[model samples]
Target: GTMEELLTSLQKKCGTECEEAHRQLVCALNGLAGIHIIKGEYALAAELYREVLRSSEEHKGKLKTDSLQRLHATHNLMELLIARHPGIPPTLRDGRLEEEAKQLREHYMSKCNTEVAEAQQALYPVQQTIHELQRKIHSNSPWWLNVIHRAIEFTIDEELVQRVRNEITSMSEKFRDCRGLQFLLTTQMEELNKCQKLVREAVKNLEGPPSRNVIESATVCHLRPARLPLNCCVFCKADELFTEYESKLFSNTLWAISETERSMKAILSFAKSHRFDVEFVDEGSTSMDLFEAWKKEYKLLHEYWMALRNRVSAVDELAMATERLRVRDPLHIIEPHEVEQNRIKLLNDKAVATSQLQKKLGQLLYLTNLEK
Candidate 1:
């Protein structure tokens, strides 16, 4: 209701009888676009922005000021699209749009360069003051005068010596070929100017008539998947066993074993406290039936227990093989290290293997006892 009220009350709502409705729709759409942008759905936001622009254009005469504001907003959004979603530019790219993009880039670049220069200028006075203080500390003067001067010098040194040294070193490293800070700053400013010029050129291309052929490109391409030998026995076997039945079985068995062990321990404790023979049974027909039932359940559970043990053995083998490959494979093996270093690696591997096995076992147990 608040939204609808605001839309109806907006200055853009004029001339058309459905102005209120139009306003409501535009506002709602813009709000949705904002949400999409917040959620990192840049493409969706760009699309919505386009729709808003189209609507604004349709009511241009009636909503001149509103249209202008919306256009500016759309331009800002396009700038974001250029920076982030450059890959999709080909689809949205218009000559006029490209020109606008170039102009915005140049505008921002110039602003950034100016700000950086201003920062450099501000830094100079502080640096000169530091130098003057240092000079005073080194100067041969009266003891008290020297003390006063030296105090200021020491104070500055204590606060800033290390920091300034680090900054200068870093700057030197960054611009090793350059003469000094002034040269470095000038070089950086020139680079920014170059970027601005490029953007301007791009904008010119965009604002002109559509090109005969469009070039589709991306700023950041997807990384290629790591090349691994799928045919390697170790890889094949590990993938087959670990990714399928063995893993599932191990998980189920582990969970069941843990639960069963807990229950058994509790029962045994109770029997011991009561001074009862834990394994004793009365000699009778009912006793025989009870024994048979217990035997049947135990046999089935014992199968699972045995399966768990087998799986654990297989996991150990896999882990050993994996470690061996790491030490032997040309791609993976590093230079021979001390036994201590090797031991550390082995220990880490063991820990990882144990953790993975436990996790798998837990999952298997969960699935197996879902009905229970």
Candidate 2:
């Protein structure tokens, strides 16, 4: 059978209870939704996604909750609704992950036909000629010997050639429809990837507020008799990784840190009421050492972060640094080590200060013996 015949046969098997090739309506709807979405059918696409979500919602019983699936639908539906914004569709208002959205139309060709697809479109005329040749050969004129010496031409009422023209017209219209859909598909997919990033960011944002150790969490937890200045304090967002200091500096740092912790705690509380708010949960479930290994990572990153910041401070205080992104060979984006010895010295001093802090705190609260 031809391609059309094969397709027709395969489509015939879908039924209410066929047993062999039965109804896969949801999968079919999902796939066709993609195609329809590509065709600028926003309302219809929204409807399809809604139906999918509805099936999940109304169908759950002994099967249990589809938390992952629900989130997936929530993600896509929110993305689509967001992309519908009239004021700021192309650009983002909050300026979060929106830069990714704008890069799509800017990153591609006039349309979706890249160099490869453009080549296919290029040979379309030659393809038409070949099809014309086949029609000429199959039409009535030659009995295998008549056209041997004669150049073939179509009759006035040329049925085959006329049929070819009609088909060409029909195909051209179909191609236009396909091209229209492809254009939208290209645009929306780019936007879709940006929305995918949006979903990722939303999930990340919902993963609890950034609650780490702040300098204020300690009311002078330092056992020793030493005190320190404000700027060189160790900052942490995780309580387990918190370093205690006899911090007396009345700066916005501790206040902001505590405020952030408060909000994060509050936000988790805000979501805790709903069952679907898997958005927040106490580490009350996961084991300690698991999180201990996790919390232990902060010290390593803190060291690198300190080194990078110290290098930048050295350059900034150098007094003649240009405002551009220019930095000396040793500093800008490198980790842990600056080219200049003075910057390295500053970083080491900070490390020593924080080291004394953590050590002093360990002695007061937990054990100071085996941190190594």
Candidate 3:
């Protein structure tokens, strides 16, 4: 049916006749070994080649050292040993097989021209180059993986932001209800304050060349408080204080962390889009050009990181504006026309808020989509 089937049938026929059958069996063994070589079964192929060598010696009744039969088997065995198989290191016999193959080819060449010898000579340098490049790829793989893993580690994720949110929520509960937990809450709050400070520093540092004027302006606007009528009663004052604390302090920290996490995410997404990570290294050979490409990508990501950082102050502005809208007390109205005008003013405020929300959300969409 196939070469493999025909070869197996020939081998079975050799069991009876010893003379011509031995020569036939040698061809059959070599053919089967060739099939196995194509099938990537190097061990079986090597064994079959060795079997052919044995059969050739048996048929001849005397050893032929430079015989083509022996050379065929030896060359095939050397190829099986030298060819880069998966997870098999090159030069397993410390160049012994390679040296033998070269010497035999040279002797065969000196006697007469063989196309196989010429082909082997041509392939030698090319195969050596392949092995050298393979070694470099193996070495570069870990370094690439390490760089990608480190960047992923350094990038903030939503899970981290959620954890901080839960922490603040728990602390707020303690601050409100339990007086005994005040000491614990104080320590936590102080730590959170430090965390906020660190996040600011991180954003600023990543920004590189700072945008002083715009940043300071945004900071001023974000810190400014809306005017309010003074509260008289004790419980009312406490309620106001509580609201201000939660809105200003707690919400600010949450926004800072959330914004930083988002910025990091955007930067990492940009890195991925550029195929600068080890995940993309599998697509082709790892070269010095890839290293240069990564450097360029890193610089671009840094620029985007700073761009996102600059928006933090604007995020704070939006948050504070939303908080002010929630807390502003309505003026008492007696006149019917005045009430209608007040409703118009309220509608206008709602329109302004909606417009601001859309503008901020649109900017966010722009930033994230830019990575693609």
For lDDT, the strongest prediction is 3
> lDDT of all the models against the reference?
0.38, 0.32, 0.42
lDDT-best of 1 and 3: 3
Ranking by TM-score: 1, 3, 2
| TM-score of model 1 vs. true structure | 0.21
How would you encode candidate 1's per-residue C-alpha lDDT over 1-372 as one tens digit per residue?
986565544422223323434444554455445545545666776776677667656655443323322544456466555687673344544336556435534553453345434443443444354444344331233122222233344453222223323433323254332123224444443453354344323323332212223211100111111353333332223233332322222224222322212222332333344343323211122223322333333333333333322333333332322121123224223344432454455445545544553454444445435436
124, model 1: CA deviation in Å? Answer: 43
All-Cα superposition RMSD per candidate: 36.5, 38.2, 38.7
Of candidates 2 and 1, the better by lDDT: 1
Pairs that collide in candidate 1 are 95-206, 95-207, 99-203, 251-360, 251-361, 251-364, 251-365, 252-364, 252-365
Give the deviation of candidate 2 from the true structure as CA RMSD.
38.2
- Report the lDDT tens digits of candidate 2 across residue range 87-187: 22332323332342233223422232243234334444543544444443322322211211111232222322233234333222322332232243344
Once model 1 is optimally superposed onto the true structure by TM-score, how far is the C-alpha of residue 80 displaced, in angstroms?
A: 2.8
- Top-TM-score candidate index: 1
As for candidate 3, its clashing pairs are none
TM-scores of all predicted structures: 0.21, 0.18, 0.21
Least accurate stretch of 10 residues (summed lDDT) in model 2? Answer: 14-23
Q: How well is each residue in 1-372 modelled by candidate 3, as lDDT tens digits?
A: 697676555544432233333444454455555545544667776776666655555535322333444556666676556664543344343356556556655564442233323432443454355445445544433433333344447663233333334544433233222222324434544554454344334433433333555444434443332344334322223333333333423335322322222322333343454456554444233333333332333333333443443344344433332121111235112243343444355445545544553454444445435446
Q: By TM-score, is 1 or 2 better?
A: 1
